[PDB]
Design a protein around this ligand. Structure first.
Ligand code: COT
Length: 166
């Protein structure tokens, strides 16, 4: 009968478009590319929705995390578009908060809720992600430890890989 003020839930392929709209501003308007195009978003929300989490305010997505499982110690170029069902690492492909909702703790709240959420899952023993050097201290607040230059290439952007035990 109404739109919940605040709601945390895993995403579905139906949310793909909203997710991509946030990326267009959060990533594309910045570097000219984004972690996941519409097909890549749908792919993981189809294969491993349980590894996604979204924040909806008044029926609109304002924050999201989209992941999949990885089965190797370090992140590789191929891991970008893969889901390894046998893996034990929750690979965070993207984390973003709508432009009109940043710097209010939502991203940190979502990330903490996400770590516990995937950490509840039997297989998930570790969480991994890559980020630009400016965000390394941010993720260290969540237990992530920098693990050297990430092997992954994306345009002229370079990233630092980070691992967090769960
Ligand atoms: C960072 C985030 C999620 C925090 O949200 P928030 O605003 O709600 O934050 P909080 O309120 O919870 O907390 C604030 C903290 O966020 C940190 N922060 C925010 N903006 C920052 C900046 N410009 N530089 C350094 N630290 C910053 C600060 O340290 C700040 O601390 P302070 O309270 O002390 O000020 C939010 O600002 C956001 O959605 N940004 C745009 C997308 C993005 O970069 N996602 C993450 C990439 S890291 C993971 C990831 O997605 N990797 C994919 C990598 C990737 C693959 N392909 C690509 C193609 C292009 C580009 C990137 C990729």
């Amino acid at each position: 009968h109404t739109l919940p003020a605040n709601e945390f839930r895993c995403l579905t392929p139906e949310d793909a478009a909203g997710v991509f709209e946030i990326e267009r501003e959060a990533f594309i308007s910045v570097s000219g590319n984004c972690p996941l195009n519409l097909d890549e978003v749908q792919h993981f929300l189809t294969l491993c929705p349980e590894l996604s989490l979204g924040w909806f305010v008044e029926g609109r997505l304002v924050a999201f995390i989209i992941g999949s499982l990885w089965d190797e110690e370090r992140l590789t170029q191929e891991s970008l578009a893969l889901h390894r069902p046998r893996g034990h690492s929750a690979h965070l492909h993207a984390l973003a908060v709508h432009r009109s909702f940043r710097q209010q703790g939502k991203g940190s709240v979502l990330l903490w809720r996400y770590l516990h959420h995937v950490g509840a899952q039997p297989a998930v023993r570790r969480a991994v992600l890559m980020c630009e050097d400016a965000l390394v201290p941010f993720f260290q607040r969540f237990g992530f430890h920098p693990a050297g230059p990430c092997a992954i290439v994306v345009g002229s952007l370079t990233f630092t890989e980070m691992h967090c035990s769960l």
